[PDB]
Structures are given as structure tokens and as C-alpha cells.
Amino acid sequence: WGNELASAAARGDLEQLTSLLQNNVNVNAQNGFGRTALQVMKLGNPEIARRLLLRGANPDLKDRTGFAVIHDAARAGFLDTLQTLLEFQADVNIEDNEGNLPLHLAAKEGHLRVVEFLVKHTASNVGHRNHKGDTACDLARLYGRNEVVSLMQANG
Amino acid sequence: NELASAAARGDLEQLTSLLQNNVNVNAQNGFGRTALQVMKLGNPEIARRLLLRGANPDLKDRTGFAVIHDAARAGFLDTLQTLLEFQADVNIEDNEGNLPLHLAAKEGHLRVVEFLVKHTASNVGHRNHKGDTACDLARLYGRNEVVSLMQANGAG
């Protein structure tokens, strides 16, 4: 179960995942390397996230390096999974090892729609400074994410 | 409109006259609903005649329910049985992954549950999105007679 459930999620095989969920499984079980199905899930599959969360998957878990799935979703620009994570109470203000929130990571990578959603429809602390004293907008400015900067200062 | 309203208000005679003239059994009214969907439950003959004449039994409404879900949920054995005699999928899932068995069990519709566990292809072990079997739902809602019936039939 735990291993196979993680495997199906990592591969993005919804059919196999749903087949596996018919069993009495602990969706928060850790695979061979200490990550759960939700943590290893191939992004771009919001339904897999939904099915894992509907079964009780903890979204706030962190990996080797203090990253929660929402950090990964924000950094890579996967709005759908970020939103489903949030509809299931995931913490928007979860910080990585350096004090960065999902907003810092989306801002840094120039994911305008993700930043817009976080700034406008979430509890994201827009003024949160990471450990080096940088806010998400500071990182957007540093990485040349002009549209993100403009958007951030237009509403926050 | 003629066929749909006839089904909706239980006018078996008008419905049958309409059917004799090869009326389009699967026409969708202004709200996108067929005669079988608007059909008032407790009128198995209307269901039977529509089906006999070509009504799609597996159609889902906008809330994600097939007519068999409605009949099981409300305790209308007769209509559920006829739906099945015309190939309706007993294992059709609503938006939450519930089978008609889950809905009948949760509502304590003993005779409906009895028929599904004894004379149909219902997957008695099917889990919905929260991971619950029909028997799990029955105990969750305190339907002990339903729990007893299921356990007495190998469906616990």
C-alpha cells in the first residue's frame, strides 16, 4: 500500500492510485525514502492530490529540506494543486529552511497567476521577510520578475 | 416538454400515449433534463416504459447523481429494480464515490440494501472518496439494522 500508493502518485497514474485507495491504506504512510504519496506526487495532477487529501493526507509535511508540497507547487507554477491543497487546509504561510513562503518561491520564479491568487485570495503574509531579510516582492525584483513586482505593489 | 412533464407529474397514461408515437425519449428540456430524470419517484411503470423505449438509465444530473442514486437514497425499491432490469449500472458512483448501496445504507433503507446485497452486482466492498464502505456509512449514521443485515449477508 504505502509504497505502491506513493509510486502511483509519483508517476501521476490516477487510475492506479484510485485502484489502490480501494484498499485499507494509510495515505500518510512513508515510502522507502521517507516521503508520502502526497509529497512525491507528480504535479499537474490536482485530482490525485484531491483523492489523497480526501483520505486524510497531511499537506503540511516537509521533506529532507523543509519543503512542503505547496512550496513545490508554488515554485513550479502549478496553481490547481496549490488551490486544492489550500481547500484542504494546507498552511499558506509554511516556511522552507530559509524563511521563504510559497509566495516567495512563486514570486522568485515569475508565476504571476500563482502570485495573484496568493496575494488576492489567501492569508499569505505579503510582508514576510525570509531569514536574509527579503520579502517575496524583494525576490521578484531581484530576479527581474517585472510583471510580478508591478502586480504585487498594485495590491499589497 | 410533453413527455417530461408527464413523467414529472406521474401521468402514466399520457406518457404511454406519447411513447406509442415514437416521441424522442431522451429529449432534454430547457433545464437540460430528460423525462426519466424529472420523473417523480414511486412510479416504476413510468421508469419501465421509458427504459423499454430507449431512455438512458446511466445519465448523471448536474449534482452528479444517476436516477438509481436518487431511488436508493430515497428508498424507492421498485424504480431501482426496474432501472437494473434495463442495464443500469449498479456500481455507478456519485461525486463523493458513493454507490446506490452507500446511499441506501446511510439512509437506513433496509429493503433497498437487502436487495442490493442479495440480488445484484453491487461491489459490497467499494470505498467512497473518504474511504468508507456502505457498511461503514451505516454504522457511521447509526443504522444498526442495516449493519446487521449486511453482516448476515457477507456484506460487512
From Swiss-Prot, chain B:
Question: Which cysteine residues pair off into disulfide bonds?
Answer: none
Q: Which residues cross the membrane?
A: none
Q: What name does this protein carry?
A: Cyclin-dependent kinase 4 inhibitor C
Gene3D superfamilies with a match to the protein in the record: Ankyrin repeat-containing domain
UniProt KW keywords: ANK repeat, Cell cycle, Repeat
Organ and tissue specificity: Highest levels found in skeletal muscle. Also found in pancreas and heart.
The source organism is Homo sapiens (Human)
Record-stated family: Belongs to the CDKN2 cyclin-dependent kinase inhibitor family.
What GO terms in the biological process aspect are recorded for it? negative regulation of cell growth; negative regulation of cell population proliferation; negative regulation of stem cell proliferation; oligodendrocyte differentiation; regulation of G1/S transition of mitotic cell cycle; stem cell proliferation
What are the boundaries of the signal sequence?
none
Task: Fill in the subunit field for this protein.
Answer: Heterodimer of p18 with CDK6.
Keyword Cell cycle on entry: yes
Q: Could you tell me the gene encoding this protein? A: CDKN2C
